Amino acid sequence: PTAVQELNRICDGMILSSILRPQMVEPSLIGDVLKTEPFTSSLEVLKDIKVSGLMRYIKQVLLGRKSYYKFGEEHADGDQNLFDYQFTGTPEEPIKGYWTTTISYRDSKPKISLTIRQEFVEGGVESQAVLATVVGRPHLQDFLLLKRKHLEYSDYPESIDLIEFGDVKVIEKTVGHGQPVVLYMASLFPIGLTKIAEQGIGCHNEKNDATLKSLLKTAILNMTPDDVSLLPRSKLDAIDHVVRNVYLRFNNSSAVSYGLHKLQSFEKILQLNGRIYETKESTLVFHHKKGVLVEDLKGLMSYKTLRVSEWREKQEPEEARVEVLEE
């Protein structure tokens, strides 16, 4: 288990400890994680490798830091002439009907990027462009720079040349001001702010995957329906962050068997956060009246315009009748 993999595993343990109760990101937290799960590589190795986020704060506590994590401490302008190029979908292979391209200033945190999403519509392509950036930046100059890079990157499509700065949805993130932060439900709550920063959940080995599913059910179990009706919107969004990540780890039969949807306190969470949950298999609706429902284009019922049927356990008599079609 290298130094990175151990760093990954300690971050897993902090995320898992965030499920049952909020915890301030400070060295004691990392210390409790090291109990059942120590750091076995050398501290000298750790002084070499460079990581970011909470794994860097794990590294610094392993290297003796006694102060708590300070929101905004990672701030960085990035290199204005080094760009990162990433994309999902293409015009020839779009994904869920869309293709999206994001170009950003390398090593910028918060990340200063221009994302251009596109789809085929009647009359050609519609584009939706988002400039994710920081308060006070030269937005127009930034846009015009990242736009050029989009044009040069994708062989100058007409559709991108047509996007004006006035077409661009601008999102200004604030840098922290050094607020201490609380980790709860895989999300950071900076003290003094109302927003959260959702963190990557991790938990990709079998053991931590099974722990994550266990802890979430127990966490919800540890709330009364009144407890849920009292939570701030920010903790609810935090819980949403974890719930949706868990259900993407199940097929429909496992998800229903998991049983989190059957709990009273979770029904109160469904009223505040929504009933529609993607899974590994498709999408379920945990409805308070109809029961468990499953996405189904042949559905006689609709939930927020999603066609659904009653999810029932797949039994072999339905599949024996599946008509194999001539090629």
Added chain:
Amino acid sequence: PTAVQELNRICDGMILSSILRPQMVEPSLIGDVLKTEPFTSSLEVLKDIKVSGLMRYIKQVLLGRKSYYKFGEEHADGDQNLFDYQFTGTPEEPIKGYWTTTISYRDSKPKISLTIRQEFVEGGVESQAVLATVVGRPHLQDFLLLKRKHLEYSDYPESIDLIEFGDVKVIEKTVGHGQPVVLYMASLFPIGLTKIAEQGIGCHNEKNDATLKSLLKTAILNMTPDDVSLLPRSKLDAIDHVVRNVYLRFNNSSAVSYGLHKLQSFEKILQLNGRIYETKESTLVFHHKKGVLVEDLKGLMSYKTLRVSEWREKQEPEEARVEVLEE
């Protein structure tokens, strides 16, 4: 208005003219497109615009290139220290349990990439890697570079570290020898290899999108079923390239209305090219016995293991009976 929009439309004019009539890619072809889509900007601003493909060939002709396009002239190793990142799903958010990443050398043509597709299965992670590259490359050494970049990029390098070069499928494309090419159905036919080089289809504006769709239908309409059975494989694959792009532009209702699938000669295209077509909305199967079928996990038919049901147009009286559920 502008030079980029003009270049695109000269490029669209070639792609569109190629649907019905094959033509050598040489400067006289761009001359005759300039009749319908002139170039009003100055050659001096033309010289800053960086393009590839036919867009760059047009630019070169406008700047006075009088030689014909030579297959393989765009071949470039790329920068082995600059990388592009394509992802389809995520370890945090997989798509139907899968996530795929492709990392490639920036500006490599043919593209040299390593594609790792990964799934969460019972217990661990199954990976499949493909190295798409060029005849003659240092395959192992390219794999090890691209695998490193995949380890640095991954939210889960543990599952990547175990993939060995013996586990990786290699596809090698060949570079051209300077052959002249014919453009037909948006594809280059080098004289006289047996393969084609599919070209990107632009047509991002109202005029060229609508005409792209009417020409493809006109092309098929003006072949009988006997004409289609006499098409070589390379011409079948070119038609396939225009058919599949066109159907990515419609939702399912629009794809069906377009009616290309009702032409008897298209039924012969279907037998020879496949029945499964991706649209903007779903996957459709143009079946010869059952009609238009739509991918449907809960369908009672299967086409080549694809679960499907009969596609059904929205009818207001039926939509009126859909039980709208309470939120």
